[PDB]
């Protein structure tokens, strides 16, 4: 069967270049156009270009002309997409996709490659309480960390009902931030302990924060 296996995650500074590979197997590599499509976090698909592995002709979207280079190594059935002068707007998941026959549509897709563009360095979060006060709401603020992700549990996972961990938001400083909240009965605030367990693997940060009214 057809298989498109892309290279792993990339982390680049603005101004650098990145080279994503797409290894094809299960079919005649030269027989089908390969397209590249990217998706920036939380928005739609954007076509970048195609290469014809038979001969190597390319066609790039105008907005990447001069910035992007698409190549292929027929001898290892691998297509490449190199994007230079990276900008923050280039942070996205990049997909290679193959035409089924000769129609301009994307029948077979690689698994995608995340390319992070950031000037920030690894950093663990600061965990601040969101003090509460038939239902009361409390939570924990996980501020200023990089890269994603963090994981938040409540009472070491013993409390899962009513928990809401929001998607992280990229601040203008290049650091991420999120809050995790939980609703609990008002009648238990004076005696029940609520501890959010925050985990940021990149920085070895494991902070347990008691949240008292």
């Amino acid at each position: 069967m057809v298989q498109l296996v892309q290279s792993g995650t990339e982390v680049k500074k603005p101004g650098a270049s990145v080279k994503v590979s797409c290894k094809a197997s299960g079919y005649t590599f030269t027989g089908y156009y390969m397209h590249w499509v990217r998706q920036a976090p939380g928005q739609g698909l954007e076509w970048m270009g195609w290469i014809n592995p038979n001969g190597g002709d390319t066609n790039y979207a105008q907005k990447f002309q001069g910035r992007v280079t698409m190549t292929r190594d027929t001898s290892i059935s691998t297509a490449y997409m190199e994007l230079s002068s990276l900008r923050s707007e280039d942070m996205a998941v990049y997909y290679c996709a193959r035409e089924y026959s000769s129609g301009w549509y994307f029948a077979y897709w690689g698994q995608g490659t995340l390319v992070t563009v950031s000037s920030a360095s690894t950093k663990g979060p600061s965990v601040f309480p969101l003090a509460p006060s038939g239902t009361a709401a409390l939570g924990c603020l996980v501020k200023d960390y990089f890269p994603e992700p963090v994981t938040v549990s409540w009472n070491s996972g013993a409390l899962t009902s009513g928990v809401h961990t929001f998607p992280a938001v990229l601040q203008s400083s290049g650091l991420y931030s999120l809050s995790s909240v939980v609703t609990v009965p008002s009648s238990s605030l004076g005696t029940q302990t609520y501890i959010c367990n925050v985990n940021h693997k990149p920085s070895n940060t494991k902070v347990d924060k008691k949240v008292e009214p």
Binding site: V37, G44, L45, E46, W47, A61, Y95, Y100, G103, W104, Y105, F106, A107, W109, G110, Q111, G112, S126, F128, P129, L130, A131, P132, T135, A137, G139, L141, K143, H164, T165, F166, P167, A168, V169, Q171, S177, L178, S179, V181, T183
Partner: protein, 207 residues
């Protein structure tokens, strides 16, 4: 050059109902159009090609039609698996996408406000959080007011994905100020407007 308009941006239906997504091309440039499905955390997936041809392995509940400028994807008897994002495509052009949402009865948000913590204040920053809990539809308007003065451009919102049990949304709105600016004002309030509320709801506190 060529713009593909998908309609509506969001479609709210129940499982077992018929979904009809629309894709309109500004200038007809082909009788052939392709539809793709993207589930959370997955790569896009081709459903239909050349307007009405179903891709290999795609369930038959997906059918496409249309010619010229107007194209339609029909999902007969929606299933929970199907509430996802769908894109249309012609050549290098993509539609903005249509999110297929689980419909439910309107639910007003429970609103809570959280002052900055003493620990964070020690560090010279103040984060005021406004929480909107378990509401539907997703459309919500949050307005921060400091000393009864409307703020602009100094807050950030984050919304959860629709809950798997009650199909509601939650939303956070974070107002971030320096310690200095936070202590120059006394009143902090977040005003919430939602179609489930007869009048806006304001949660406030004095520093």
């Amino acid at each position: 050059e060529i713009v593909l308009t998908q309609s509506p941006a969001t479609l709210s239906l129940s499982p077992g109902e018929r979904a009809t997504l629309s894709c309109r091309a500004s200038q007809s440039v082909s009788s052939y159009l392709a539809w793709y499905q993207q589930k959370p955390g997955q790569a896009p997936r081709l459903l239909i090609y050349d307007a009405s041809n179903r891709a290999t392995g795609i369930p038959a509940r997906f059918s496409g039609s249309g010619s010229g400028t107007d194209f339609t994807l029909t999902i007969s008897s929606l299933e929970p698996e199907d509430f996802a994002v769908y894109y249309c495509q012609q050549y290098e052009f993509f539609g903005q996408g249509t999110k297929l949402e689980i419909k439910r009865t309107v639910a007003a948000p429970s609103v809570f406000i959280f002052p900055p913590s003493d620990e964070q204040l020690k560090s010279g920053t103040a984060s005021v959080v406004c929480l909107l809990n378990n509401f539907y539809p997703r459309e919500a308007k949050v307005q921060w007011k400091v000393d009864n003065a409307l703020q602009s451009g100094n807050s950030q919102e984050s919304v959860t994905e629709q809950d798997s049990k009650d199909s509601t949304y939650s939303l956070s709105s974070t107002l971030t100020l320096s310690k200095a600016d936070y202590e120059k004002h006394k009143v902090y309030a977040c005003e919430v407007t939602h179609q489930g509320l007869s009048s806006p709801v304001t949660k406030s506190f004095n520093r």
